[PDB]
Write a protein that binds this ligand. Structure first.
Ligand SMILES: Nc1nc2c(ncn2[C@@H]2O[C@H](COP(=O)(O)OP(=O)(O)OP(=O)(O)O)[C@@H](O)[C@H]2O)c(=O)[nH]1
Ligand SMILES: Nc1nc2c(ncn2[C@@H]2O[C@H](COP(=O)(O)OP(=O)(O)OP(=O)(O)O)[C@@H](O)[C@H]2O)c(=O)[nH]1
Ligand SMILES: CCOc1ccc(-c2cn(C)nc2-c2cc(OC)c(OC)c(OC)c2)cc1
Ligand SMILES: [Ca+2]
Ligand SMILES: [Mg+2]
Ligand SMILES: [Mg+2]
Lengths: 67, 421, 440
């Protein structure tokens, strides 16, 4: 009975800790996956705006190189 | 969030912009020198949105006055509230655009754009918390149409997470009979669908028709059109400008009005051009739309309604519910609670009770279809292309702009035809 | 000890906190500057009101509470208003830019910039405590901060405080008061991401509080001030057990033993009475029998559902004022015969009773009449799943077309998080269905 008394309280700690662990990790997974996703969105937005500039350089050369 | 940075490009943008600044200065208790002569604390409480606080309690617009033609600088400065503007915020070019979008966007306007951006960067940096930008311009001209949609694009590179509003003035034969405005609008619309968060389609054909039919004027000036455009621009900013129990910023409006990121072209409305049930029926009536479309030819994805004046808020709640009940077919079933309503105590000057309407309706395709018809009339026989291909553009870019605007129409149709089950 | 730290998140929370803390001060005879004349132990004490108020050496009674909002307008009114002296400046926390009705901005984008500061400020209150019991979290389901930042906070508190109890007072959205188009999305998103981390959650349907103010207080178009002053009386009835001495006072954790049969089934239906105007209450004394019978009239519920077309797993009656056991017992006996109260076959059908003697107060120039007795019923009914149903349908109508989902994806969320949340809600609806079924 004494070894069972310790087996219960050790288990109580184990699962309390496990809940903190898998909460702590699941939250880290989300905040990293999010930051990757948000920057992926803003990088593609800026890459489409940087592609517009290169097109406006082809238009400004087709005026110069058609005279 | 609080501060908006205003930009007026071209002639139309500067005139409708000037009217906007006269009207909201009047409502906030501001005179052409820039002193608070009012009475209510409500006038000042969210003054920071559109004004900077210079020394000696001076209130100065956060506006950036731009055009490739001078003289527009003079008419704005000679006009009623010309004094109040900040002198370095004027950024004016030399030779003008001559109704050429390719000049405004790619060649001539591309030179001036950097010194415009400097005034933006100077104003934006001094904001406590910059929320976004608003552009007043036309899609028919050269500067506002072309250089405006470049500034949109360029401001998006340095402020990609800020809101980008536009009051885009859509062209019409009935008001202005230049032959290549259908080309300029369609080229602008190709930029607006990609680079703005919400665009108020202010339409000249709607403005002419309202001036003729409702307001009884036999042949109307640009002054008569802009009495409306100013009252509309006064209405949709009312919630940003004053307190109420709603907070109101550009993000929350944009979030709630824009179900899909391309479909952000609002159909404004105003009433009267009086009792609450009349007001309510007037603002949803097709005659009061500042875009040339019938709401009964599509469905409302989202609507925002702003009432101004002392009135029973219990009566307004009952009435807006009434029109949704009775006209249930003209709102989409798959977006619940998709019509919102704010009330401001302080009415506009002149009227005791006004009502302002903002609707993202699928019936806007009717406007884009009209511009597509006038465009495709010219383009399919290659008419007037030398103006543009001279300045360096490909024919490919006219096809892609034609295609992207027809996609926008097709998408507004997709969601009009969408059902719940 | 047995201290209780209150966190108010976003406008709704903040504004309900103003109501709640104003009311608590009137109940304990605390002045707006924080002084308590009746408190003789200067600097500290082991009294029942000390569960919600710490004391300074100067004698200021300071709420054990934090106010957070991602924009300053709403908290700034606390900072300049009547009770500005009551709070230390560091209990009032703001950013500059809000979450814009976006769970994504409240949980991630704007939220991650202030989360550490908030937990640091909660921690400073926790270290004043000799025997912390847990947290009360006040927020809206609808708002970006109320949904997003709350969820973030709840997750982080589970890390820092382990299994230490966390109760919610959630404001369920309704179109009568302000609503946004995307509130169903925020509601499902926060309800999913908080469900593991909340021990008990009292939902408050704004429509229910709206209808009550219209019907019972004769208020034509109720304001937030009207709704919050009613809400705070219900909040006070639940927390009264923690704040007052009492022979026949049952503690709120003891009711929770009965109210929560499984961990996910932690959503009690609050029902309060009497809500009555000064005009109608004149020469009209409402007995224990009358107010107890009103608890089963569903027009007095904090959440719109029909308990009569569901099944009970728990019934608790929290009386305050001039009440004694005898009358309560008579009143319950009356109800058992005349009313539609079916329990599940696995629960015992008793009603658990508590009584505080400290009679219920009202805010001066309020709409509620001062009454000699009052009662808040907390029941665990399967009917409350109807609130999840109405909200889940609205979610489904928009999500079918992906309406507005780009605002969330833009700020870093995936489509997976929507379906994950919605399937959790589908499970929760099925759990509330399964518990009602009879055994074999
Ligand atoms: N409603 C309204 N429309 C206007 C006004 N002024 C010009 N427009 C319209 O604007 C279109 C032409 O654009 P403008 O703004 O005049 O030209 P711009 O953008 O300055 O370009 P450039 O003149 O080439 O420098 C026409 O269709 C006009 O009907 C005005 O005050 N009100
Ligand atoms: N009962 C009650 N409900 C409120 C109050 N304020 C807001 N709400 C409700 O809360 C929801 C909106 O969320 P808010 O709490 O205002 O927003 P927030 O948490 O500040 O989030 P953001 O402003 O988006 O950062 C809507 O359902 C409103 O009806 C209040 O004082 N009382
Ligand atoms: C159909 C959905 O439309 C909505 C919902 C909400 C809002 C909104 C939310 N807040 C906090 N503020 C606004 C708001 C509302 C307005 O008109 C009713 C405004 O005037 C145009 C406004 O100014 C930008 C903000 C908006 C639309
Ligand atoms: Ca003491
Ligand atoms: Mg010009
Ligand atoms: Mg807020």
């Amino acid at each position: 009975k004494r070894e069972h008394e310790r087996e219960v309280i050790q288990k109580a700690i184990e699962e309390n800790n496990n809940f903190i662990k898998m909460a702590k990790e699941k939250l880290a997974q989300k905040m990293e996956s999010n930051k990757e996703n948000r920057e992926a969105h803003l990088a593609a937005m800026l890459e489409r705006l940087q592609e517009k500039d290169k097109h406006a350089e082809e238009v400004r050369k087709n005026k110069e190189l058609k005279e | 969030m609080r501060e908006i940075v205003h930009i007026q490009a071209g002639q139309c943008g500067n005139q409708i912009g000037a009217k906007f600044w006269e009207v909201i200065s009047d409502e906030h208790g501001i005179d052409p020198t820039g002193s608070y002569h009012g009475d209510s604390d409500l006038q000042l409480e969210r003054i920071n949105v559109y004004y900077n606080e210079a020394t000696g309690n001076k209130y100065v617009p956060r506006a950036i006055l731009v055009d490739l033609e001078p003289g527009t600088m003079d008419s704005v400065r000679s006009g009623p509230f010309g004094q109040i503007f900040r002198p370095d915020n004027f950024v004016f070019g030399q030779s003008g655009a001559g109704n050429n979008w390719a000049k405004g966007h790619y060649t001539e306007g591309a030179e001036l754009v950097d010194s415009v951006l400097d005034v933006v960067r100077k104003e934006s940096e001094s904001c406590d918390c910059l929320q976004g930008f608003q552009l007043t311009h036309s899609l028919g001209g050269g500067t506002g149409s072309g250089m405006g949609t470049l500034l949109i694009s360029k401001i998006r590179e340095e402020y990609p997470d800020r809101i980008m509003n536009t009051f885009s003035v859509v062209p019409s034969p009935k008001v202005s009979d230049t032959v290549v405005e259908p080309y300029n609008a369609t080229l602008s619309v190709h930029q607006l669908v990609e680079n703005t968060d919400e665009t108020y389609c202010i339409d000249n054909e709607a403005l002419y028709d309202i001036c003729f039919r409702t307001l009884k004027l036999t042949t109307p000036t640009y002054g008569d059109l802009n009495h409306l455009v100013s009252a509309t621009m006064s209405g949709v900013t009312t919630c940003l400008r004053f307190p109420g129990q709603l907070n109101a910023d550009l993000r929350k409006l944009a979030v709630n009005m824009v179900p899909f990121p391309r479909l952000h072209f609002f159909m404004p409305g105003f009433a009267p051009l009086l009792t609450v049930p009349e007001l309510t029926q007037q603002m949803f009536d097709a005659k009061n739309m500042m875009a040339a479309c019938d709401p009964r030819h599509g469905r409302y994805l989202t609507v925002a309604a702003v009432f101004r004046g002392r009135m029973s808020m219990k009566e307004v709640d009952e009435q807006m519910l009434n029109v949704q009940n009775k006209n249930s077919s003209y709102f989409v079933e798959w977006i619940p609670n998709n019509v919102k309503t704010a009330v401001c105590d302080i009415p506009p000057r002149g009227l005791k009770m006004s009502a302002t309407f903002i609707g993202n309706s699928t019936a806007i395709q009717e406007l884009f279809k009209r511009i597509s018809e006038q465009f495709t009339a010219m383009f399919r026989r290659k008419a007037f292309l030398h103006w543009y291909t001279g300045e360096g553009m490909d024919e490919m870019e006219f096809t892609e702009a034609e295609s992207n605007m027809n996609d926008l129409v097709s998408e507004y149709q997709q969601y009009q035809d969408a059902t719940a089950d | 000890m047995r201290e209780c730290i209150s966190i108010h998140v976003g406008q709704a929370g903040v504004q309900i906190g103003n109501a709640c803390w104003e009311l608590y001060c009137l109940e304990h005879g605390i002045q707006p500057d924080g002084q308590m004349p009746s408190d003789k132990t200067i600097g500290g004490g082991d009294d029942s009101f000390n569960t919600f108020f710490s004391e300074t050496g100067a004698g200021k009674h300071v709420p054990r509470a934090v106010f957070v909002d991602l924009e300053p307008t709403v908290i700034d009114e606390v900072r300049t208003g009547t009770y500005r002296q009551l709070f230390h400046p560091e209990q009032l926390i703001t950013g500059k830019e809000d979450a814009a009705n976006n769970y994504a901005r409240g949980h991630y984008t704007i939220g991650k910039e202030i989360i550490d500061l908030v937990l640091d400020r909660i921690r400073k209150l926790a270290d004043q405590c000799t025997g912390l019991q847990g947290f009360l979290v006040f927020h809206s389901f609808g708002g970006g901060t109320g949904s997003g930042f709350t969820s973030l906070l709840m997750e982080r508190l589970s890390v820092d405080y382990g299994k230490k109890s966390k109760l919610e007072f959630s404001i369920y959205p309704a179109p009568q008061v302000s609503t946004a188009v995307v509130e169903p999305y925020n509601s499902i998103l926060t309800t999913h991401t908080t469900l593991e981390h909340s021990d008990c959650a009292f939902m408050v349907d704004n429509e229910a509080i709206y209808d009550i103010c219209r019907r019972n207080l004769d208020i034509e178009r109720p304001t937030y001030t009207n709704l919050n002053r009613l809400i705070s009386q219900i909040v006070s009835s639940i927390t009264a057990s923690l704040r007052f001495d009492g022979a026949l006072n049952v503690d709120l954790t003891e009711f929770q033993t009965n109210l929560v049969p499984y961990p996910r089934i932690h959503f009690p239906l609050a029902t309060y009475a009497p809500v009555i105007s000064a005009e109608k209450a004149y020469h009209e004394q409402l007995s224990v029998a009358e107010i107890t019978n009103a608890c089963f009239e569903p027009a007095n519920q904090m959440v719109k559902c029909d308990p009569r077309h569901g099944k009970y797993m728990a019934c608790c009656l929290l009386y305050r004022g001039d009440v004694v056991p005898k009358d309560v017992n008579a009143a319950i006996a009356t109800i058992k015969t005349k009313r539609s109260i079916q329990f599940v076959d696995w629960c015992p059908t008793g009603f658990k009773v508590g009584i505080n003697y400290q009679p219920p107060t009202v805010v001066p120039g309020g709409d509620l009449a001062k009454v000699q007795r009052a009662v808040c019923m907390l029941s665990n009914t399967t009917a409350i799943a109807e609130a999840w149903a109405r909200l889940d349908h609205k979610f489904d109508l928009m999500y079918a077309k992906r309406a507005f989902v780009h605002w969330y994806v833009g700020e870093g969320m995936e489509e997976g998080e929507f379906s994950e949340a919605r399937e959790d809600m589908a499970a929760l609806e099925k759990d509330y269905e399964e518990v009602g079924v009879d055994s074999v």
